[PDB]
Amino acid sequence: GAMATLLEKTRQVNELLQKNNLFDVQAELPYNKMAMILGDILESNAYIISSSGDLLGYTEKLDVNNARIKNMFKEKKFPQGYTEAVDMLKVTEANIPIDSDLTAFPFESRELYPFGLTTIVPLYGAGKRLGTIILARVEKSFNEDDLVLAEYSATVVGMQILYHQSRTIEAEVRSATAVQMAINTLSYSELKAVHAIFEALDGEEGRLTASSIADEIGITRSVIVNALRKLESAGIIESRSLGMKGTYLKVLNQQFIKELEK
Amino acid sequence: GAMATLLEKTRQVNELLQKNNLFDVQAELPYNKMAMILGDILESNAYIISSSGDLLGYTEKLDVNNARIKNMFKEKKFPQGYTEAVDMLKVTEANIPIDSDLTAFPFESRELYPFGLTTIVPLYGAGKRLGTIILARVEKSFNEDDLVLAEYSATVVGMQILYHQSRTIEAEVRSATAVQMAINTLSYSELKAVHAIFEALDGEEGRLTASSIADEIGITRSVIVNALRKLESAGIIESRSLGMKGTYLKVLNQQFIKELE
């Protein structure tokens, strides 16, 4: 039955994607396996795009009988602006024809697959946009059965993404709060000093002559140094004394500069 | 339109639960609103059980006719071990009759609800058991349309639970790193000052006089104030100066005192 068929597919999705962790560390794309499962169950080509527009994984059915080794290693790339455009879609769009710029088919293929259809499914979970799932079928349309399964699949993918994010979050906030406290522990004296330090110390890593720079900024010569010992003891940079040459520094938290240029 | 009906319901679930954050902080149960939405769309009473067997939220349809304003305040309680038992179910079990011990209906109602049916839906996401959703209907059976919707609903709830877990780790590590690094910026002097500052406060808010603290503990004021502007710049207390009268402070990180003691 249509409903029994749909149900069994949702069960297959559950067994394969809800009851397993599918983040492939060291894969070409971390979610290629997840995309493959989705494309199989949904009988589609499938692409998983992060909330920032990065392709996280995809599956395209290979034409085995006509395969050519030269063509098999080509990386799928979406046209300039496609990932930003899909992000503007806030609800599912189904059966997008190939003449739309939202088609998942390369634009060269518009002639080859005039009836190719694309369905774009925003991934929302817990109020957040988590990315987007894109499905493409050369021949069949997406019916209402397919849309339910697609929406079901998006939530399962959303959970995988939310779970992967959770494993990172502890180390992320530890570093952000550290940057924030180090920024707070600064005066105008040391801060505009720090600003110029990263300016001269271009590349994030390089040598520095704190004394010389002091003149460049019109800041007291002890004040310049106070920012240094604060940041390094706070744990954001590394230093070794070069003697007359100066002191050589190393940026250890790269999100710092983003917070200071804000 | 059986399929169109299901799709519209999944979309209502999306609009209401996928596109909103639904953790009711400082509420009775954080997921009471989530349970109500689910019970509405699934035409059931609904219970949300955490991975550890704690009831996180539920909704039961009130009968206006027999309402007693005092009986409306009773906390829902399951037979001991029921919430732990449901965790041993690893796949959905639907249309559980009232004669089973896994029924969601209290047994007192078992006489009044001959056809009461219970459906238990494990919440799995990303390989983890995230809890369980329990659905109860007076009579109508859970057909395949309902199970699809129910399974759909379970993933959506799972996302909420997972999202809350990450925001709980985020706020904990934010508070620990803030407290601990603030301690590291304190000398023997500044520590002994802050200690008595919190003793003087005695609780999360209060008034204190910087001069007096120096006199009471024998540390020059500069040290006392150096610690204050340190704690306030670190973002652990809020302050407004009353001048000669003194200074008013507010504890913003309550796990600080535990770490200092």
Author numbering:
A (entry chain B): -1 to 260
B (entry chain A): -1 to 259
Give the exact sentences the study uses for this entry.
In Gram-positive pathogens such as Staphylococcus aureus (Sa) and Enterococcus faecalis (Ef), the pleiotropic transcription factor CodY plays a key role in integrating metabolism and virulence factor expression. CodY DNA-binding is activated by two types of ligands: branched chain amino acids (BCAAs, i.e. isoleucine, leucine, and valine) and, in most cases, guanosine triphosphate, GTP. Each 30 kDa protomer comprises the N-terminal ligand-binding domain called GAF (cGMP-specific phosphodiesterases, adenylyl cyclases and FhlA). The GAF domain is connected by an extended linker helix to the C-terminal DNA-binding (DBD) domain that contains a winged helix-turn-helix (wHTH) motif.
